[PDB]
Amino acid sequence: SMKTIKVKNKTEGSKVAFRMLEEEITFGAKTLGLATGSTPLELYKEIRESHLDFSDMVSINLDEYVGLSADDKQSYAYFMKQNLFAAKPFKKSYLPNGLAADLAKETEYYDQILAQYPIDLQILGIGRNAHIGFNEPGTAFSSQTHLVDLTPSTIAANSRFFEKAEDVPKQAISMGLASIMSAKMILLMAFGEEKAEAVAAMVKGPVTEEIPASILQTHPKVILIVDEKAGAGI
Numbered sequence: 737s738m739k740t741i742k743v744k745n746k747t748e749g750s751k752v753a754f755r756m757l758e759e760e761i762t763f764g765a766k767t768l769g770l771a772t773g774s775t776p777l778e779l780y781k782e783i784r785e786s787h788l789d790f791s792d793m794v795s796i797n798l799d800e801y802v803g804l805s806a807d808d809k810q811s812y813a814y815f816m817k818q819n820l821f822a823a824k825p826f827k828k829s830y831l832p833n834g835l836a837a838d839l840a841k842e843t844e845y846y847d848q849i850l851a852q853y854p855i856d857l858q859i860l861g862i863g864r865n866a867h868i869g870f871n872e873p874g875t876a877f878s879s880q881t882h883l884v885d886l887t888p889s890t891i892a893a894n895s896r897f898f899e900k901a902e903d904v905p906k907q908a909i910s911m912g913l914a915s916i917m918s919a920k921m922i923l924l925m926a927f928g929e930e931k932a933e934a935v936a937a938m939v940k941g942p943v944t945e946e947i948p949a950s951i952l953q954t955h956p957k958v959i960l961i962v963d964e965k966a967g968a969g970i
Contacts, residue, residue: 738953740960741959742967745964746927746963747778749961749962749963753923754786757783764856766856767794767855769857776861791826795829798916799909800832803903803907804905809897816829843881854918855918857920857923858922862931864931866934866948868949871913872887875913880914880915881912882909883908883909883910886906924949926962932967936970939970940969
């Protein structure tokens with residue numbers, strides 16, 4: 737089941753997401769899966785300014801860059817601190833350890849954290865090419881937490897923030913598509929013309945690894961919050 741809520745713009749969609757989030761908490765949600773990127777930024781702002789209280793709750797993020805500490809300003813840990821956790825801390829917030837000595841031990845660890853704390857509500861965006869998290873076209877639907885080689889476009893974009901070419905992460909530790917699908921409820925937010933092709937492929941195309949988001953067709957409880965421009969093809 738995929739319900740679609742069509743909204744005017746990102747501001748409106750973010751407010752709908754907030755109301756839905758509050759309701760899930762009121763009805764007992766305890767573990768949240770969180771998103772990075774620009775998609776959830778207005779949602780996070782609304783949460784920071786709200787009366788929500790995450791003190792008895794757990795959060796789990798999808799990804800961290802290999803080679804970055806949680807204190808590094810380019811890390812997803814730091815992004816989450818700035819945008820959410822400084823204002824609204826959780827009982828515990830998990831992200832992969834980018835500094836892990838053994839990346840295979842770290843991927844196994846993260847899978848076990850997901851088993852220990854199954855996610856009640858996952859907030860998600862969609863990529864222009866229908867990627868989900870760091871899972872690009874071709875990713876197996878069976879994938880659990882895994883090491884991802886960043887796309888060259890991503891590396892080029894991120895390079896602008898480092899010394900220091902040797903310092904630019906080339907990999908991430910990322911929740912896989914099977915990992916993400918385990919959430920009891922998924923809220924996918926998509927805004928702008930740039931997302932329209934991906935949204936149409938997700939909703940109307942075949943289920944195929946060429947379109948990572950297409951696996952969401954098979955999830956029992958996905959709600960799509962899409963503005964008019966992102967929803968143009970559905």
